[PDB]
């Protein structure tokens, strides 16, 4: 792809984080802690899952960023509406305001309803995410495999400002402690 010139500097919004997450000083990395991280509750925090939003809001234009997923067993990545549900149980779908892909149990899937199987020959260590607001497109790229396309959501109905979306996943196995990291431009 040739989307690299739309690169944006994303930072994580601490206030939106699940209370078990640990965000680095530079707000560019996040991981699952082994306990509650001693923060007050608020209406923005994702309560049920290890999720956090980017601070940036997008309502126009073309945006691109990259995320490091090295040695993780489970994660979700993409964008979501600013007004997505924070509390309780929900599925990741465009109907609920999410445009995402994930790794789970050794398979990659796009967060459609129902979910779509992805075909990845080279397990990615870094993912590129491209949003074209006006076109209604969210695309995912395999940076480890020379930028090859993973998935495109088209005919997106954003219906609001968009925020970068992250889920570090649970660590029931002891094999998923590694962070998500926003990669430098
Ligand atoms: O944004 C949407 C959508 C949201 N509500 N209804 C449709 N889609 C992305 C892929 C095709 C459906």
Short mmCIF file of C-alpha atoms and ligand atoms in Angstrom, two decimals:
data_model
loop_
_atom_site.label_atom_id
_atom_site.label_comp_id
_atom_site.label_asym_id
_atom_site.label_seq_id
_atom_site.Cartn_x
_atom_site.Cartn_y
_atom_site.Cartn_z
CA UNK A 1 0.00 0.00 0.00
CA UNK A 2 0.95 3.74 -0.31
CA UNK A 3 -1.06 5.06 2.78
CA UNK A 4 2.08 5.71 4.95
CA UNK A 5 2.01 9.55 4.22
CA UNK A 6 -1.40 9.83 6.13
CA UNK A 7 0.46 8.70 9.31
CA UNK A 8 -1.00 10.22 12.53
CA UNK A 9 0.58 10.18 16.04
CA UNK A 10 -1.88 8.27 18.25
CA UNK A 11 -1.76 8.38 22.06
CA UNK A 12 -3.87 6.34 24.50
CA UNK A 13 -6.58 7.98 26.67
CA UNK A 14 -6.03 6.74 30.32
CA UNK A 15 -9.56 7.84 31.30
CA UNK A 16 -11.16 5.28 28.89
CA UNK A 17 -8.95 2.35 29.99
CA UNK A 18 -10.24 -0.68 31.84
CA UNK A 19 -9.03 -0.36 35.46
CA UNK A 20 -6.55 -3.30 35.09
CA UNK A 21 -4.61 -1.70 32.19
CA UNK A 22 -1.15 -0.13 32.54
CA UNK A 23 -0.40 2.62 30.01
CA UNK A 24 3.21 3.77 29.59
CA UNK A 25 4.37 7.34 30.47
CA UNK A 26 4.54 8.24 26.72
CA UNK A 27 0.89 6.95 26.29
CA UNK A 28 2.12 4.75 23.38
CA UNK A 29 2.04 1.28 25.04
CA UNK A 30 -0.59 -0.65 27.02
CA UNK A 31 -0.60 -4.02 28.77
CA UNK A 32 -2.81 -6.09 31.11
CA UNK A 33 -1.84 -5.77 34.78
CA UNK A 34 -2.16 -8.73 37.18
CA UNK A 35 -4.60 -6.67 39.42
CA UNK A 36 -6.73 -3.45 39.62
CA UNK A 37 -4.39 -0.49 38.93
CA UNK A 38 -5.76 1.71 41.78
CA UNK A 39 -7.70 4.24 39.64
CA UNK A 40 -11.21 5.67 40.38
CA UNK A 41 -14.14 4.43 38.26
CA UNK A 42 -15.78 6.74 35.68
CA UNK A 43 -18.45 6.43 32.97
CA UNK A 44 -15.80 6.33 30.13
CA UNK A 45 -13.96 3.13 31.31
CA UNK A 46 -14.58 -0.14 29.52
CA UNK A 47 -15.77 -2.33 32.48
CA UNK A 48 -15.94 -5.91 31.12
CA UNK A 49 -12.91 -6.21 28.76
CA UNK A 50 -9.27 -5.01 28.66
CA UNK A 51 -10.08 -2.16 26.20
CA UNK A 52 -8.85 1.43 25.80
CA UNK A 53 -9.38 4.22 23.20
CA UNK A 54 -6.95 6.60 21.49
CA UNK A 55 -7.27 10.26 22.57
CA UNK A 56 -7.59 11.44 18.95
CA UNK A 57 -11.07 11.93 17.35
CA UNK A 58 -11.47 11.82 13.56
CA UNK A 59 -14.51 13.23 11.65
CA UNK A 60 -12.90 13.73 8.14
CA UNK A 61 -9.84 12.84 6.02
CA UNK A 62 -7.47 9.94 5.70
CA UNK A 63 -5.56 8.58 8.74
CA UNK A 64 -2.97 5.75 9.10
CA UNK A 65 -1.21 4.23 12.13
CA UNK A 66 0.63 1.02 13.08
CA UNK A 67 0.44 -1.27 16.12
CA UNK A 68 2.97 -3.86 17.35
CA UNK A 69 1.32 -7.17 18.44
CA UNK A 70 4.56 -9.24 18.87
CA UNK A 71 4.13 -12.48 20.90
CA UNK A 72 0.45 -11.89 21.79
CA UNK A 73 -2.06 -14.75 21.70
CA UNK A 74 -5.22 -12.54 21.66
CA UNK A 75 -6.09 -8.88 20.84
CA UNK A 76 -8.61 -6.71 19.01
CA UNK A 77 -7.64 -3.63 16.90
CA UNK A 78 -9.39 -1.04 14.78
CA UNK A 79 -11.63 2.05 15.23
CA UNK A 80 -14.93 2.72 16.88
CA UNK A 81 -17.53 5.44 17.32
CA UNK A 82 -16.90 7.85 20.18
CA UNK A 83 -20.38 6.86 21.52
CA UNK A 84 -19.86 3.05 21.80
CA UNK A 85 -21.20 1.30 24.93
CA UNK A 86 -18.55 1.12 27.73
CA UNK A 87 -20.38 -0.97 30.42
CA UNK A 88 -21.51 -4.60 30.33
CA UNK A 89 -21.31 -7.22 27.60
CA UNK A 90 -21.38 -6.46 23.86
CA UNK A 91 -20.12 -7.88 20.53
CA UNK A 92 -17.66 -6.07 18.25
CA UNK A 93 -19.70 -5.30 15.10
CA UNK A 94 -20.38 -2.33 12.79
CA UNK A 95 -24.00 -2.33 14.13
CA UNK A 96 -22.52 -1.61 17.63
CA UNK A 97 -20.08 1.02 16.24
CA UNK A 98 -16.86 -1.03 15.82
CA UNK A 99 -14.64 -1.73 12.76
CA UNK A 100 -12.10 -4.27 14.05
CA UNK A 101 -10.06 -7.44 13.44
CA UNK A 102 -8.74 -9.82 16.07
CA UNK A 103 -6.54 -12.79 16.91
CA UNK A 104 -8.15 -15.51 19.07
CA UNK A 105 -7.18 -19.21 19.50
CA UNK A 106 -4.69 -19.25 16.65
CA UNK A 107 -7.15 -17.74 14.06
CA UNK A 108 -7.62 -14.19 12.70
CA UNK A 109 -11.17 -12.85 12.12
CA UNK A 110 -12.85 -9.58 11.09
CA UNK A 111 -15.49 -8.22 13.49
CA UNK A 112 -18.47 -8.44 11.10
CA UNK A 113 -21.79 -9.94 12.32
CA UNK A 114 -21.32 -12.81 12.09
CA UNK A 115 -17.47 -12.74 12.11
CA UNK A 116 -15.43 -13.35 8.93
CA UNK A 117 -12.44 -15.71 8.63
CA UNK A 118 -9.20 -13.95 7.57
CA UNK A 119 -6.53 -15.68 5.39
CA UNK A 120 -3.06 -14.75 6.77
CA UNK A 121 -0.05 -16.89 5.66
CA UNK A 122 2.56 -14.78 7.63
CA UNK A 123 1.41 -14.13 11.25
CA UNK A 124 1.77 -10.36 11.68
CA UNK A 125 4.03 -8.74 14.28
CA UNK A 126 2.80 -5.23 13.24
CA UNK A 127 -0.65 -4.21 11.84
CA UNK A 128 -1.31 -1.05 9.77
CA UNK A 129 -4.79 0.59 10.08
CA UNK A 130 -6.08 2.98 7.40
CA UNK A 131 -9.30 5.03 7.72
CA UNK A 132 -10.81 7.04 4.86
CA UNK A 133 -13.67 8.91 6.56
CA UNK A 134 -15.29 10.34 3.41
CA UNK A 135 -15.09 7.04 1.47
CA UNK A 136 -16.43 4.98 4.45
CA UNK A 137 -13.40 2.59 4.42
CA UNK A 138 -11.35 0.91 7.19
CA UNK A 139 -8.47 -1.28 5.94
CA UNK A 140 -5.92 -3.47 7.75
CA UNK A 141 -2.41 -4.30 6.44
CA UNK A 142 0.20 -6.95 7.39
CA UNK A 143 3.42 -4.87 7.89
CA UNK A 144 5.46 -8.12 8.50
CA UNK A 145 4.41 -9.35 4.97
CA UNK A 146 5.40 -6.25 2.89
CA UNK A 147 2.11 -4.44 3.71
CA UNK A 148 -0.22 -7.09 2.23
CA UNK A 149 -3.98 -6.47 2.66
CA UNK A 150 -5.68 -8.31 5.54
CA UNK A 151 -9.24 -6.91 5.36
CA UNK A 152 -11.31 -3.94 4.06
CA UNK A 153 -14.60 -2.78 5.59
CA UNK A 154 -16.34 -0.72 2.91
CA UNK A 155 -19.74 1.05 2.87
CA UNK A 156 -19.02 1.93 6.51
CA UNK A 157 -21.69 4.01 8.28
CA UNK A 158 -19.47 5.72 10.94
CA UNK A 159 -22.40 7.91 12.18
CA UNK A 160 -20.12 9.92 14.50
CA UNK A 161 -16.55 10.86 15.33
CA UNK A 162 -14.12 7.87 15.30
CA UNK A 163 -11.51 6.88 17.90
CA UNK A 164 -8.64 4.38 17.63
CA UNK A 165 -9.71 1.17 19.45
CA UNK A 166 -7.51 -1.40 21.32
CA UNK A 167 -8.09 -4.62 23.30
CA UNK A 168 -4.94 -6.21 24.86
CA UNK A 169 -6.97 -9.40 25.67
CA UNK A 170 -7.15 -11.43 28.86
CA UNK A 171 -4.17 -13.38 30.13
CA UNK A 172 -5.81 -16.56 31.54
CA UNK A 173 -3.09 -18.66 29.74
CA UNK A 174 0.01 -16.84 31.06
CA UNK A 175 1.03 -16.44 27.38
CA UNK A 176 -0.67 -13.10 26.57
CA UNK A 177 1.04 -10.58 28.93
CA UNK A 178 2.88 -8.71 26.14
CA UNK A 179 1.81 -5.11 25.37
CA UNK A 180 0.22 -3.44 22.35
CA UNK A 181 2.64 -0.70 21.20
CA UNK A 182 2.00 2.22 18.84
CA UNK A 183 4.95 2.13 16.37
CA UNK A 184 6.91 5.26 15.41
CA UNK A 185 6.38 7.10 12.09
O1 LIG B 1 -20.48 0.28 8.71
C1 LIG B 1 -21.18 -0.68 8.41
C2 LIG B 1 -22.57 -0.72 8.90
C3 LIG B 1 -22.96 -0.18 10.11
N1 LIG B 1 -24.27 -0.37 10.22
N2 LIG B 1 -24.77 -0.99 9.12
C4 LIG B 1 -23.75 -1.19 8.31
N3 LIG B 1 -20.67 -1.70 7.70
C5 LIG B 1 -19.22 -1.84 7.48
C6 LIG B 1 -19.09 -3.02 6.54
C7 LIG B 1 -20.44 -3.16 5.89
C8 LIG B 1 -21.41 -2.76 6.98
#
